[PDB]
């Protein structure tokens, strides 16, 4: 039951912090690895940070990686994303993207608008 | 126009030779009585394949009968070949009238041999001698003055056979007067030549050059062949015959095999004169109809269309791993429908896909780059070929692909898939690695974080519907057939045929291969259903696996032949018995009718009669029930008279056809319970009969080695290698041989010493004239003995037969001394009495010799001597008429010919098995010995030894059984010899049918003949009788006879002849009084 509904995304000011989440429709969450991408309007998707199956292995991207915070929460059925030291170039629709099983996994699409 | 080939077309098969031999063989022959196309001329607009040509080119068809007639030499050669042109090789054989030249030259197409140039032309036929490959010259195949010097018309029959590159050619020459059509009468066709050609012959045409006719009024253009010479043509068909060879070694006559049932009997029983009798011939069970039959109903399915039509596939790197099983498959739609862009299968043929079976099937599906499509195959290298999904070099089902720029590609740009560059775990084939491979050790000079700190091998692959190959997404799914690891589970869509009713069908229910007729059955199988059984694989009942109805399968449902013939010498009609076929099934392969047109064979005649053992096709059932004859089965028989109702009938019932009544063993001859009134002999007949017992067989021996080996030392090695079988075989044959001698001694040498045939033969009016040996005529075989030694088939079919290992050691007692023994037996029988076996033979005159042999049935010597004259003369007459029937009836001695023929068959079949390879590369010994090296020789030859040995074994055993039963017969023979030659036995119906008198030995080639002279009474008469007479208050009882009354006077007579007497004391025994007894009467005693 992999109906992944992205959650947490919302309007944010440049430099703020917010929680981002996603939920499969009542399933296991350990083995389904999440990935998070930025798609600015006027261009297409890019990548900033991600995670492993463990969740402890916070493998972010190659760009500045201390920006975002990740946590897979098997006890609460949601991933948790805390973005920090923000910049206006992340106004994008993100996708929780649980890799396991279905690779191209999404189905809600969470909007994160970085305001002035 | 059609004419019958009455008897022509017969030719000596091979240059082999025989003499007075009824040999048979099957070669390509012109069938008897076949329609032949009388080609005459153009017969304007009568040409269909050629133009202005009288008798167009015709198909070859592996053999043709040819014959041209003329009043003067006209017809030229022929053209054989396939195209009859320079294009393809063809044959030309022309008569130069000076010589014959045979050429295979590829001549240019001449529409006619006689293009108009009537006769002044110079060999118009020889259009071109290009590529002349063969040439030969011989004496001409000439024709006329037969045609005019005798003023008859002349003939040349020909047969152009192409058999194994060899072009056999035959001919004859003969006058004829009845020029209208081909005559009856017999002939043959000796060859002239063989030609090792090897061409393929399909078409051929006759050649004739118009010299000058007068058919048309042109005075030069009169050259015309519309009304000229003619010729017939037939076709040869693979039918066996039975030939009849001459003393000089000529083909005197021939008979067909498939023409008639009668000819087929002839060739079964190799001869030209069969006698009346049913002849089991060649059986014909059935040709089964079409094919497998199961049903159109319940089956299962794998959800293939679930996944293939699933328009959402996943990453190539994150390739799906899907296992599918426990269904029924179908790869028709995928393999044939144009949905796929690519279909390529590796070690699994797409055609046979459905009929194969696999334990597990895996579906690994994704989307691929268009240019990368090449890398899904065993033996591919590349980024995806190494790091997304790698095929191994082994059995993978297929590599399917189809574009989805419509479905995978979106105009808004689709970067959603990926292709890793060069950086995962190298993919030992089938490894679903999906890990996030960001860093490797974060320090390595190659990738690390030094040098490269911004790399990620996953390269997401953007595309769009209209972008170009390489940017073209092809949907790919692979069917991984996991097979042979476990019980197979996945198979294509079987159960695909309707079932059939009541006709011989080769059926297959879920693997049950068999043939039979399906029928509505009436049981109920439990879910243990699947099939039934009577015994040990008789799968007699079965149900459909797919809709659950049960059925019966009875056999291929029948064939039979039992041809009836009343005898060639006295009729020529034939009717066929079919063993156990309700000929509703029109017996042969129902309504065979693919055979020669022959109403019996074309079995549809209204003259039919079903019985227990099938029906007679040539049947005219009657309800009048005479005596039995050629027996049919379950009572019914045949063979009435010529004139039942119509004169055209023969003794063969209903001539040209046959009836079959039901056997009636005769009439009725009852008497009823008499009160006491006897029916007793007043007159009678002494009479005589015959009997024929084999008492031996011809001796035989078979040196085991020579039969098997015959001087091939290696065979002798291997034969001594098979233990001591040879010793047993030789010993058994020796045992039966010496046994034969013992039987002869026991049968004939019972008496101690010869008592001579008395010189003055004056035997009480009891003339012999025929039984005692010749007065002084050669060999001292008696006249009856002579005819016994001569009417016996002196041919024996001609056993005079030792060729190899065979032999015949001669008997001990020879026929001269054997006849001497017999004559002695006669002499003691006639002069001595019944005592020439009980000690020293005494002497007694023949009148008493038979008076006290009458006393051996209960009649005193008043009887004979009173009628000695007429009784004697009756003996002479009867024994003379013996001579008659023994001299007359064909097949009278059938028992001894039966025996000698049995041994004949034994040995003949033995040598014929000698001529058989029994699985060896050849039958003859020395070549296989000398054609191969040691080991393969010895093994194949050993196969030959084992076959030969088993054959010899069967012969020896069969001989043992035959010998033992002949032993029993011989013991019976000597026993009869004793009881009724050395005495007079009484065991009823042993010494002749009736009250016995005496028996007379007579010699035989291998048996013996007795003459049981019996007492058969006659002229019964009825009188009054009484078991007692009460006289003086006292009953009477007869000593020597019985009291009989005329109705008014009582008379004393005996029990097997009416000889009444007065009632007197001395012949009547007297006890008690009239006791409790029925039938007692008055008119007492003197």
Residue numbers in the entry:
A (entry chain D): 2 to 117
B (entry chain A): 27 to 142, 151 to 834, 853 to 1138
What text comes from the article?
The spike (S) protein has two distinct subunits, S1 and S2, and the receptor binding domain (RBD) in the S1 subunit interacts with the host cell receptor. The S proteins of SARS-CoV-1 (virus causing SARS) and SARS-CoV-2 (virus causing COVID-19) bind to the same host cell receptor, angiotensin-converting enzyme 2 (ACE2). After binding to ACE2 via the RBD, a protease on the host cell surface cleaves and activates the S protein, allowing the virus membrane to fuse with the host cell membrane. Here, using the S1 domain of SARS-CoV-2 S protein as an antigen, we screened an extensive DNA library and found a standalone VHH that is specific for SARS-CoV-2. This new VHH (termed K-874A) bound SARS-CoV-2 S protein with higher affinity than previous VHHs and does not require any modification with antibody fragments, making them a very attractive therapeutic candidate.
As a result, we acquired two types of the complex structures, named type 1 and type 2. The ratio of type 1 and type 2 particles was approximately 9:1. In the type 2 structure, K-874A was bound only to the RBD and not to the NTD (S3C, S3F). The S protein trimer was in the prefusion state with RBD moving upwards. All amino acid residues that interact with ACE2 were placed in the upward state of RBD, even when the RBD was bound to K-874A, demonstrating that ACE2 binds to RBD even in the bound state of K-874A. These findings demonstrate that K-874A neutralizes SARS-CoV-2 via a different route that did not involve ACE2 binding. Rather, K-874A prevents the virus from entering the cell by blocking the viral membrane from fusing with the host cell.
